[PDB]
Amino acid sequence: GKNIQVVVRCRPFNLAERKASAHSIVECDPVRKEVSVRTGGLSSRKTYTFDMVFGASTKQIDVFRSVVCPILDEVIMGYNCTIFAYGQTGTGKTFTMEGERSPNEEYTWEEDPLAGIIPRTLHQIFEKLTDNGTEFSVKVSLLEIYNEELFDLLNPSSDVSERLQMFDDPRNKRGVIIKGLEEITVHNKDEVYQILEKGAAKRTTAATLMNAYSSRSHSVFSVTIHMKETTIDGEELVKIGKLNLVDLAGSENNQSLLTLGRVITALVERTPHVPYRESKLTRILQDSLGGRTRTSIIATISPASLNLEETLSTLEYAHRAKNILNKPEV
Ligand SMILES: Nc1ncnc2c1ncn2[C@@H]1O[C@H](COP(=O)(O)OP(=O)(O)O)[C@@H](O)[C@H]1O
Ligand SMILES: [Mg+2]
Secondary structure, three states, X not given: OOOEEEEEEEOOOOHHHHHOOOOEOEEEEOOOOEEEEOOXXXXXXXXXXXXXXXXXXXXXXXXXXXXXXXXXXXXXXXXXXXXXXXXXXOOOHHHHHOEOOOOOOOOOOOOOOXXXXXXHHHHHHHHHHHHOOOEEEEEEEEEEEXXXXXXXXXXXXXXXXXXXXXXXXXXXXXXXXXXOOOOEEEOOHHHHHHHHHHHHHHHHHHHHHHOOOHHHOEEXXXXXXXXXXXXXXXXXXXXXXXXXXXXXXXXXXXXXXXXXXXXXXXXXXXXXXXXXXXXXXXXXXXXXXXXXXXXXXXXXXXXXXXXXXXXXXXXXXXXXXXXXXXXXXX
16 A cells, blocks of 8 residues: 555547557456556466556546545645656547546536546535635646746746746755746636636647647646635644646656656655656656655556557556556466
């Protein structure tokens, strides 16, 4: 058991994989928490074991309830947590972390069944803290890391080529200060959608003008909750919660992903001198990874033979981050 959790989500087939005659090579056993890959067919097949395994049938709501809700509970109690989406471009990192809008109908009191972790997170924060009388405020920031350089995606008025500078925080040795990072106040439950729209417009502008392609860059979405909870005949709680929702660069890409791997592996194995400072991303997230809290990695994969090499590469990366023994085959 552990505060570091590694899970695998397999997306269903697209149409390019079906027409190209590609065949499914991945077996996901949620009950046994196992992913099996036909590397030869019928000979052998390689089995991996993880903390949870979500098959191609998994809905967004199930990912949120299983992975995020236990973590969001710790955030609302006043801790800093991080959830990663790792995997090959096109396997569902952004779909899992952010989700999509359904063009049919219009969800208002109901969550879009395609909404991802970020919208469901903000909606649960607003509904839970309003329902229990908490005096609370919410801030969100969104930055992008390309070529080890930081770009704010929420600054309404910056110069596209302006990169954020990062300084050590004299108050907490494990924290950093991202000078100029825009932090938008979220005033109600649904405001997150227009926030993500502004960030997407800044993202494509940075792509067209600076070649900062979103498939090759990390996206760090941080939600900060300041909380004052008053209970007559109880206590007055002043809490600050922080959840970083990290949509990583495509894993087919270079060293910052391997640095993130060495950090998680070191946190799992409890080896000294976790190499936080060897990459910008892990230095950003040190205060949420260092202080003992909950961290989850959602490793996304494709089931088609077309992507065999990168799927094996992803499972190997997730296995190296948290090595769990395979239970004896039945
Ligand atoms: N679990 C899933 N269920 C249904 N569709 C998915 C799933 N994961 C990914 N997709 C679809 O695959 C396409 C690419 O996914 P995307 O989120 O862009 O992957 P990535 O962000 O890793 O590049 C999108 O059209 C998305 O809707
Ligand atoms: Mg993406």
